[PDB]
């Protein structure tokens, strides 16, 4: 698998046209806070195609 | 008045736009900047 190519799997809101958010902040899916570390309701926002 | 800053959080988790005017040029740049706590331009 090539792991150099990625897509964003989760976001708080959809992009506007030609908007380009490169932020790597952990996706908080629920009431559980992330505090900069992965966990329950707290997932890395990108996936790699492989 | 010698420049402007635009963005969402204005800190390294986010992209932001900087305009600086230095009287020879207008310089414009878009980065995941870290801003100072009280930004300033030189005397
Ligand atoms: C733009 O940034 C704000 C920052 O609070 C965020 O709430 C909003 O969802 C963002 N909009 C888009 C379309 O990304
Ligand atoms: C370039 O942007 C990506 C995505 O935000 C980030 O992972 C990477 O650390 C940035 N490059 C540098 C030199 O920090
Ligand atoms: C204005 O900005 C440009 C950016 O390339 C630089 O070359 C130039 O020396 C600057 N002028 C002054 C007066 O700082």
Q: Which residue's C-alpha comes closest to atom 2 of ligand 1?
A: B8
> Given 3-state DSSP classes, what are the helix, strand and coil percentages for chain A, each rounded to the nearest 5?
0, 20, 80
Interatomic CA distance for residues A12 and A10, integer angstroms: 7
Beta carbons of B15 and B32 less than 8 angstroms apart? yes
Residue contact B13–A23, C-beta within 8 A: yes
Interatomic CA distance for residues A28 and A38, integer angstroms: 9
Q: Which residue's C-alpha comes closest to atom 12 of ligand 3?
A: B22
Beta carbons of A13 and B23 less than 8 angstroms apart? no
| Distance from the A40 Cα atom to the nearest Cα atom in chain B, whole angstroms | 21
Interatomic CA distance for residues B15 and A23, integer angstroms: 8
Measured between CA atoms, the residue of chain B closest to residue A25 is: B13
Please give the resolution of this entry in Å, rounded to 1 decimal. 3.3
Report DSSP state, residue A39: B
* Residues in chain B, overall count: 43
Residues of B in contact with A21 (CB under 8 A): 15
- E-only strand ranges, chain B: 3-7, 16-21, 26-31
């Amino acid at each position: 698998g090539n792991y150099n190519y990625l897509y964003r799997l989760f976001r708080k809101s959809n992009l506007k046209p030609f908007e380009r958010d490169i932020s790597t902040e952990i996706y908080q899916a629920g009431s559980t806070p992330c505090n900069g570390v992965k966990g329950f309701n707290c997932y890395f926002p990108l996936q790699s195609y492989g | 008045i010698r420049g402007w800053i635009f963005g969402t959080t204005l800190d390294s988790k986010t992209q932001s736009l900087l305009i600086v005017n230095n009287a020879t040029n207008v310089v414009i740049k878009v980065c995941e900047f870290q801003f100072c706590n009280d930004p300033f331009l030189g005397v």
